Amino acid sequence: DRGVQMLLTTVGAFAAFSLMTIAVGTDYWLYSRGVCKTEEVMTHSGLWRTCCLEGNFKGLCKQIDHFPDTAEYFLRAVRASSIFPILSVILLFMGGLCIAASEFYKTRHNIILSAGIFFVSAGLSNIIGIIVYISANAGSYSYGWSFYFGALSFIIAEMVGVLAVHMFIDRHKQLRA
Amino acid sequence: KWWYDKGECTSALSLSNVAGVFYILVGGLGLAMLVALIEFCYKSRAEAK
Amino acid sequence: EGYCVDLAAEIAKHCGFKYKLTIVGDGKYGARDADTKIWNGMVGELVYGKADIAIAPLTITLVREEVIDFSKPFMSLGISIMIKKPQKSKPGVFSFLD
Amino acid sequence: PLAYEIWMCIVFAYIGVSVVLFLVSRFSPYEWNEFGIFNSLWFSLGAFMRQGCDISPRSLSGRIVGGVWWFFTLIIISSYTANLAAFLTVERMVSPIESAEDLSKQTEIAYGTLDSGSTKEFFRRSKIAVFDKMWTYMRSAEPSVFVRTTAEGVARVRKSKGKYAYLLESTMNEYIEQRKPCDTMKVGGNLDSKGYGIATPKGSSLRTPVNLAVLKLSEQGVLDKLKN
Amino acid sequence: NEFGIFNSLWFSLGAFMRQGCDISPRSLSGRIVGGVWWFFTLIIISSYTANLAAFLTVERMVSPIESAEDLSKQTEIAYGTLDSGSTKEFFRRSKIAV
Amino acid sequence: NEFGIFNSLWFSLGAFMRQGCDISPRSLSGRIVGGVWWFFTLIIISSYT
Ligand SMILES: CCCCCCCC/C=C/CCCCCCCC(=O)OC[C@H](O)CO
Ligand SMILES: CCCCCCCC/C=C/CCCCCCCC(=O)OC[C@H](O)CO
Ligand SMILES: CCCCCCCC/C=C\CCCCCCCC(=O)OC[C@H](O)CO
Ligand SMILES: CCCCCCCCCCCCCCCC(=O)O
């Protein structure tokens, strides 16, 4: 049912982009038990700031110290600059931009394919980011709602990519008629 | 003063033990997408005009 | 400098004497050679009168108390085991080929 | 056998592989590959469970996707079986409490000392943070965590299903550990170092002879023979 | 549907991952090659799983040092004392079994 | 053919012995049944070994 497909894909693109951006900006990725700004108390650590709670001076927090065998150096570099979560954000943004431009300069029916490719690639970058994040954390705990916002952005991005590719296939099917 | 004031100091398998296989999988998915798009661009440019 | 350097200055002030710190020549604590029966280390320096007092982590033992005098303990302790930590290993990325 | 993160990332990789196989198989108008999104998901699931194929990609790119998914599946299922074999071969039971620090940081397991003794006084006067924290808890715990006799503390440990730990001298602990039903265990190192002595009234005539006798029994090895 | 070079490579790869075949050889020569490759694959993948299980099982029954009793009952970890000292004498004279 | 009672018993037996398929369900309900049976088979055979 074309028409409602466009609304569903646009809503999905916006939802995935918003969720991934909130996940990156927010810092509730890991409920560890460590030191706040320089006693061990809980903390809502994130991608950038290991932030404190239930402590003497809860709410005051700092920037995670990423650095204290080139393999460890490369992984620590890739996890310090969240290149993969940030690349996921950029690719979702460009996918949404292509979907929006699919109304102007219509009849190309070759940019909506680019939207599908961008959403799929955003999902792949997101999963690599999760893997590096969890692997670097291994150098009791739990995962916060920022982690699951990233994961849900991955799922919605993959669905929106499948819809975009379906719409591209349908458009070339109409053209072939 | 001399000891502490100047002190300078699971069973399941973890994702780290297998992370390499995930990296290979996602790299292979990316390579597959690149190959498919290269072939599509080749065919789309090979139409007689 | 050190715990015993700080303690030596204080023992000397409270006992009213001037003193000179000297490092035991053989760098040992003190044992009686089974054979020559000579005492070495800081215990030997006191037994043969090379030193007037030893201010060090010198353990009060029966065999030493038989040949030298010891104050009441200034530090309580016991033999212990020192090990290299375990140092959790980080698995390699391509460790599934091992 | 596999950490929760491995399962979660297996599910993410499943969705990603299925979507990329659907995209690559049917996106170019020149291919128009029976891999729709539903059939892509079925192929990926059946590949992971090492089950029937019934359809195999024929393109170069669909074959790259299939091949890396097959490798991933082989490694992950082999490692699940290997780690389950490891779990079943050598069983190991975890002792909730490792050291005193452990007792201090938790509250599910109660712990106490002889109601009257040098152990209770050690805690009531400790200036060490962990022991002061343990004393703060023990002196205010209700019901009382203190016992009238060592045997009472041993029985409370034995009958509390692991909800009561008992602080007592290593000597008594080591002895009870060698007593049936062999259901107790000494955990961690000693919290302090001290000694038992023969006591006499202040100024007693027996003080010097009994001090010398203890040293004689010590030096002749009698005290080690009697402990053994 | 027939074994050209690309289809031959796909068949071999799929046979190695135990991932079933969309087509199998039909001639005596093709079937000899397929059967031998299937045997090779079975032995190699079984051996991979068995050796990974050995690695994890052996690494799981390891145990560290927690006491002097532990040091006494083993020999992989060496242990000693200051060559001259009250610790060495404690051990040279101990009447305690461990 | 399609899954009659005899063919469904054969599909299930072949799934448990990890001996692949000659047919597989094509509908959503058949595929849910097949999926849970495949998971069950994998856990049980791995646990036996
Ligand atoms: C027609 C078929 C289409 C193609 C199908 C492809 C699927 C097969 C891929 C397998 C994994 C390959 C990657 C193996 C990993 C290599 C990593 C490595 O060599 O690690 C070095 C290590 O650090 C020590 O030197
Ligand atoms: C295309 C058709 C699709 C077919 C679909 C076939 C289904 C295959 C998978 C089944 C297992 C999934 C259930 C896994 C449940 C895990 C249990 C759990 O959640 O763990 C509990 C808790 O986390 C710990 O205490
Ligand atoms: C229908 C056509 C099918 C064609 C057939 C395909 C091949 C069969 C598969 C494997 C053969 C394995 C051969 C095993 C050789 C064993 C060697 C051996 O036994 O030597 C050990 C020695 O006895 C110790 O002292
Ligand atoms: C091929 C895709 C699906 C395969 C089946 C995988 C099962 C997924 C389970 C996910 C949740 C696992 C939770 C385990 C952790 C725990 O017990 O705390």
Interface touch E61/D90, C-beta < 8 Å: yes
* Strand order across the A51-52 sheet: A30-34, A41-45, A51-52
Q: Chains with ≥3 Cβ pairs under 8 A against D?
A: A, B, C, E, F
- Ligand 4 centroid–CA D7 distance in Å is 5
**Helices E28-60 and D60-89: crossing angle, nearest 10°?**
40
DSSP E strand boundaries for D72-189:
110-112, 164-166
| Cβ pair D86, D111 in contact under 8 A | no
> Hey, is A97 helix, strand or coil?
helix
Q: Measured between CB atoms, does D128 come within 8 Å of chain B?
A: no
Packed helices A145-176 and A4-25: angle between N→C axes, nearest 10 degrees: 150
Nearest alpha-carbon partner for E12 in E42, E41, E32: E41
CA of residue E39 to ligand 3 center, whole Å: 9
Residue A85 one-letter amino acid: P
- How many angstroms separate the Cα of D208 from the Cα of each of D195, D218, E68? 18, 15, 34
CB < 8 Å to C90, chain A: 72, 138-139
- Give C79 to chain E, closest Cα distance, Å: 7
| DSSP3 helix / strand / coil % (chain F, rounded to 5) | 65, 0, 35
* Contacting residues for A121 by C-beta, under 8 A, at least 6 apart: A91, B30, B33
Q: What is the CATH number of domain A4-176?
A: 1.20.140.150
- R_g of chain B, CA atoms, integer Å: 27
Tokens 């100047």 sit on residue: B6
Optimal mutation site among B26, B33, B43, interface A, most CBs of chain A within 10 A: B26
Measured distance CA(E26)–CA(E8) in Å, rounded: 13
The one-letter code for the residue type at D30 is Y
First CA to last CA distance, chain D? 44
Select the residue from C88, C89, C90 to test the A interface by mutation, using most A Cβ atoms within 10 A.
Answer: C90
Rounded to an integer, what distance in angstroms lies between the CA atom of residue B32 and that of residue B27? 9
Asked if residue D181 lies in contact with residue D190, where contact means CB atoms within 8 angstroms, the answer is no
Contact A138 C90 (CB under 8 A): yes
- How far is Cα C33 from Cα A8, in angstroms, rounded to an integer? 92
- CA of C12, closest CA in chain E: separation in Å? 26
Distance CA C30, CA C39 (A): 6
Q: Which of D98, D83, D69 is nearest to D185 (CA)?
A: D98
Nearest-angstrom CA–CA distance, D14 and D20: 10
The CA-atom distances, in angstroms, between C31 and each of C67, C71, D218, E13, E92 are: 11, 19, 21, 73, 12
CB A139 within 8 A of CB A49: no
Measure D11 CA to nearest chain E CA, in Å: 20
- Which residues fall within 8 angstroms of residue C10, CB to CB, at 6 or more apart? none
Q: For residue D194, what are its two tokens?
A: 């001290």
Cα F43 → chain centroid: 14
Query: Is-contact C98 E55, C-beta < 8 A?
Result: yes
> Which residue, judged by its Cα, is nearest atom 3 of ligand 1?
D64
User: Is the CB of residue B37 less than 8 Å from the CB of residue B30?
Assistant: no
Nearest to residue A32, comparing CAs of A141, A144, A148? Answer: A141
- The radius of gyration computed from the CA coordinates of chain E, to the nearest angstrom, equals 29
Q: Residue A34 has what DSSP assignment?
A: E
Experimental method: cryo-EM
For residues E73 and E85, give the distance between their C-alpha atoms in angstroms, rounded to a whole number.
24
The SS3 call for residue D190 is coil
